[PDB]
Amino acid sequence: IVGGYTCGANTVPYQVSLNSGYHFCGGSLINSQWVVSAAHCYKSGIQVRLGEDNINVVEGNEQFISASKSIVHPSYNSNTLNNDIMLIKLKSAASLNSRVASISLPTSCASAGTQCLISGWGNTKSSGTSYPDVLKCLKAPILSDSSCKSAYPGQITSNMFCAGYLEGGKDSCQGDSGGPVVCSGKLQGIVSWGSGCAQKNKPGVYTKVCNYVSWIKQTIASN
């Protein structure tokens, strides 16, 4: 995340780190047994780490559980990143406490202008590589579709929305993929792609979760 701040140890209690020997993506806990992340984060051999603050230091409040299965959205297109969402089931249930909590799924989509909180352990430099070890946060509004589509012509579908600042300066960045975008207490987005990080007129693009609630609910209930 670039132009963001240190959230604080466990202040985004629904934030997860996907690890396959190292941290490679973020995710959101939706209930004791399931995590939602980006389909482009699909890997075989995932370990989910909950209650994480510093990914390189075991400070006692962590839970490391292996994934029992992964379900990529049936219509995921790796070329356009359209329908970039995946569900991960935990082999054992997470013990929910003050530091490990689930986030709610939306009942309706959020309007442009709404302020959201984007978090993760990604790169913090636009022009440079600096990978932080503690969680970073960024408060950013949802942009109108018009400004999102002018920045990426022919690339935005109805399953994506942009958030950030057009001036640039603030944005999600690689590493952060699969992480949450929460607005008014609901998980409204998943970090999906962007043009580099924090550039001017290049906001981040997020998977629009409100369009997949029935698929999420139906799939978790059947698996």
How far is residue 110's CA from residue 99's CA, in Å, rounded to a whole number? 26
Which residue among 37, 40, 53, 126 is the active-site one? 40
Closest separation between CB of residue 131 and Cl ion, Å? 10
Question: Judged by CB under 5 A, does residue 175 bind Zn ion?
Answer: yes
Nearer to Zn ion, 45 or 113 (CB): 45
Nearer to Ca ion, 10 or 159 (CB): 10
Amino acid 163 reads A
Contact criterion met (CB below 8 Å) for 87 and 34 = yes
- Out of 14, 34, 76, 121, name the contact with Zn ion by CB under 5 A: 121
Contact criterion met (CB below 8 Å) for 192 and 40 = yes
How far is residue 76's CA from residue 41's CA, in Å, rounded to a whole number? 12
Segment near Ca ion (CB under 5 A), from 44-52, 72-80, 174-182, 206-214?
Answer: 44-52
Note if 84 is an active site residue: yes
x/- track of binding to Ca ion for residues 3-42 (CB under 5 A)? ----------------------------------------
52 annotated ligand-binding residue: yes
Note if 40 is an active site residue: yes
x/- track of binding to Cl ion for residues 4-43 (CB under 5 A)? ----------------------x-----------------
Burial zone of 100 (CB within 10 Å; 0-12 exposed, 13-18 middle, 19+ buried): buried
Phi-psi bin for 150: left (phi > 0), alpha (psi -120 to 50), beta? alpha
- Out of 2, 85, 176, 188, name the contact with Cl ion by CB under 5 A: 176
Nearer to Cl ion, 55 or 94 (CB): 55
Q: Which of residues 2-61 bind Zn ion (CB under 5 A)?
A: 26
Note if 73 is an active site residue: no
E strands in 58-112: 63-72, 86-90
How far is residue 118's CA from residue 3's CA, in Å, rounded to a whole number? 12
How far is residue 170's CA from residue 206's CA, in Å, rounded to a whole number? 15
Residues classed as catalytic: 40, 84, 177
